[PDB]
Amino acid sequence: SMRSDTQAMGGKSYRAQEGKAADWRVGAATDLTLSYTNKQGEAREVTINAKQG
Amino acid sequence: RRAIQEEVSALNDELNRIAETTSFGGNKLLNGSFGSKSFQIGADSGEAVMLSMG
C-alpha cells in the first residue's frame, strides 16, 4: 500500500523533555547510546561521544 | 543644559523607535522578540545554525 498513512511510509519520533537555550553547552557528561533492534532483527548499539563545547 | 537634554530625550525616544519598528517582512528584529532562530542550511534535517539578536 502507498497510502500516506501506511506504516512503512514513516517512523517513530522521540522528543526531548527538557528545553535547552542558545547558550547551553555540553559539559563533562556527553555519551549518548542508542540501543534498539534493526530491521533484520539483530540488536544494534550506536554510541555517540559528542564533543564538549 | 535643558536645551541639550531635549535633544538627548528626542534621540532617546528615537532609539526605542528603531528597536520596535525595525522588521523584516513584518517580523520584529531589534525589539528583543526575535530571540534565537535556527536557519536550515543543509540538504538533510538537523543542519541548522542558531542566530541570536538581543
UniProtKB/Swiss-Prot annotation, chain A:
Places the protein is found: Secreted; Bacterial flagellum
Annotated function: Flagellin is the subunit protein which polymerizes to form the filaments of bacterial flagella. FlaB is not essential for flagellar synthesis and motility.
Misc: V.cholerae is able to differentially regulate the flagellins within the flagellum maybe to produce flagella which are particularly suited for motility within a given environment.
Membership in a protein family: Belongs to the bacterial flagellin family.
Subunit structure: Heteromer of multiple flagellin subunits including FlaA, FlaB, FlaC, FlaD and FlaE.
Name recorded for this polypeptide: Flagellin B
Source organism of the structure: Vibrio cholerae serotype O1 (strain ATCC 39315 / El Tor Inaba N16961)
Gene: flaB
Residues of the whole record sequence present: 163 to 215 of 376
